[PDB]
């Protein structure tokens, strides 16, 4: 492939644990181990807003653009929501009695999912005073990642250190199915292929592998090997035929999504990679990753 990758913006900071693109402004949100969150305009290279949220790591953060909010989760057990235009704190509540690993936002209903070291996923309804609408129980270790199926967001996936992915339906108490990944050091990350042509999911593990799954047959389609330490994440790009992964080995890898072979390994020089975002409508094919020593926003093509 000819990826002709370009560095749009990179900056140094404390360890970046969460990262997200705004869908209509050229902004990236980073959430840091130091308790701070930053919003950067990566085209003008100017800091839009930052907040010292807490003294504990902020492990998860997303835009909720349609409400002009960011939502963040931290090791002090709290979910907090801020208006990014005013800095006003909209809500602040204890969500789990343990670390919050991952937050996902429903695209068309006022729902947020949080996944936690307390072994659960919780569904919150912001139009019902941030009510706890449902708790999804069944995992047996830390829930590391939650993601809605973008083609059917009445369902979502959770990836867990118990070596499984569970796929759930809103309003139902048990998984539609449990995938036994064979990733024996656990699942750190799960994501969906975004287009209707493939029923695919992808998982990343401390066992150095990435696996692609057909969620209709439950078969493992491919195993991607090459990373040299824990794989923090792997995602399908929304508009290019590639998969992007990142690792504690300090690299991003770009894999061909047809052949499942590595195309490019990038050492961006920020030590360990922890988190990923892709621009949701594929603007400039932008991707962004957070690392021990800061973040980078890259364009492809």
């Amino acid at each position: 492939m000819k990826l002709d990758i370009k560095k749009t913006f990179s900056n140094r900071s404390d360890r970046v644990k969460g990262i997200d693109f705004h869908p209509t402004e050229p902004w990236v949100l980073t959430t840091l181990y130091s308790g701070r969150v930053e919003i950067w305009n990566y085209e003008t290279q100017v800091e839009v807003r930052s907040i010292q949220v807490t003294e504990t790591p902020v492990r998860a953060g997303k835009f909720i653009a349609r409400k002009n909010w960011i939502i963040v989760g931290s090791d002090d057990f709290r979910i907090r929501v801020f208006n990014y235009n005013t800095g006003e704190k909209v809500v602040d509540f204890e969500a789990h009695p343990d670390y919050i690993r991952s937050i996902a936002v429903h695209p068309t209903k006022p729902y947020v999912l949080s996944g936690s070291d307390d072994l659960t996923v919780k569904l919150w309804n912001w139009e019902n005073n941030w009510a706890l609408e449902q708790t999804f129980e069944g995992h047996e270790h830390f829930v590391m990642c939650v993601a809605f199926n973008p083609k059917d967001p009445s369902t979502f996936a959770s990836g867990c250190l118990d070596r499984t992915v569970k796929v759930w339906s809103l309003g139902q108490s048990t998984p539609n199915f449990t995938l036994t990944t064979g990733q024996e050091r656990g699942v750190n990350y799960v994501d969906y292929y975004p287009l209707p042509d493939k029923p695919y999911m992808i998982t990343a593990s401390d066992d150095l592998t990435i696996k692609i799954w057909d969620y209709q047959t439950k078969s493992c389609v491919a195993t991607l090997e090459g990373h040299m330490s824990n794989v923090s994440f792997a995602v399908f790009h929304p508009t290019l035929p590639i998969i992007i992964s990142g690792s504690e080995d300090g690299t991003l890898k770009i894999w061909n999504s047809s052949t499942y072979k590595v195309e490019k390994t990038l050492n961006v020089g920020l030590e360990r990679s922890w988190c990923i975002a892709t621009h949701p409508t594929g603007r400039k094919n932008y991707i962004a990753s957070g690392f021990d020593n800061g973040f980078t926003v890259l364009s492809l093509g």
Partner: peptide
């Protein structure tokens, strides 16, 4: 553990 806290 480092896994917990990293």
């Amino acid at each position: 553990t480092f896994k917990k806290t990293n």
